[PDB]
Design a protein around this ligand. Structure first.
Ligand SMILES: CCCCCCCCCCCCCCCCCCCC(=O)O[C@H](COC(=O)CCCCCCCCCCCCCC)COP(=O)(O)OCCN
Lengths: 98, 98, 101
């Protein structure tokens, strides 16, 4: 083919717009992608806007460079290498400030 | 169009069901999206079930609120701001339990 | 048989949306933006997920949950947190409010 605009009876749309080179899927309830090898996205900016939660259910999540978070909870321990600088509050272990 | 059930000769299927508003992609080995600008997903729940690994290969991963993990490995240092509460084990640095 | 359908769309901007049954590869290329908007959930189930983003990946959500291990190059925690279990620091200095501990 050379065009893609599908509008479904529930109001969902799957479309590709060449004028702005924009692929859109909208108005759906669920999507599920099952693959036996890999799923890859290669693009400068990825935005995941999830009003409930993003779950990465995997043995390993790897962030290759920087990871920034508002708050952190580590449930079962870990390791830190390099310089770790804490500021702007109290660092405590088993109820004892350091 | 207004319907979608594509059944490929390798057993893969791409389909949309408007009564449940469900988009399904199944039976594939790999998927990839390559874009020059951005990829966005807007949905309350994002679920990634990756039996080997999820890699976020990027200068920066930003979690805008809370991040929860089982275990943590920081390879090249970092900064922590605010109150940091350690409990339920030993916090050690360069071999010494604080 | 398993099916006889095909998917190969080449658009005037050079984008391609196709499925290649020879390698079972679904490919979208040559686009500028993609967006998926859903009211319930999106699931991907696959051994390997690779997100190769030369600027940034933002997870704009109340909570990101990594069910097992999280590995990062550097870490920046902006507004506090909790760490449970054994935490081992090596290979540098852990400093709090200016004091090397
Ligand atoms: C935490 C972040 C990391 C994990 C989550 C993000 C992962 C990012 C990478 C995802 C890669 C999977 C998606 C591959 C491309 C799918 C879309 C191309 C296929 C396509 O448009 O086919 C049309 C039907 O719609 C379709 O086939 C629509 C299928 C859409 C599948 C994707 C559903 C959402 C899954 C989550 C990933 C989405 C990321 C954003 C793209 C064909 O139409 P036709 O044959 O009738 O045309 C003929 C004329 N009419």
């Amino acid at each position: 083919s050379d065009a893609l605009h599908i509008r479904f009876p529930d109001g969902a749309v799957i479309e590709y717009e060449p004028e702005t080179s924009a692929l859109t899927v909208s108005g759906i309830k669920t999507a599920s992608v099952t693959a036996s090898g890999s799923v890859t996205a290669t693009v400068p900016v990825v935005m995941v806007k999830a009003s409930t939660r993003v779950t990465l259910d995997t043995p390993e999540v790897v962030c290759t460079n920087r990871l920034i978070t508002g708050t952190l909870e580590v449930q079962k321990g870990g390791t830190m290498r390099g310089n770790i600088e804490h500021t702007g509050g109290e660092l405590s272990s088993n109820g004892k400030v350091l």
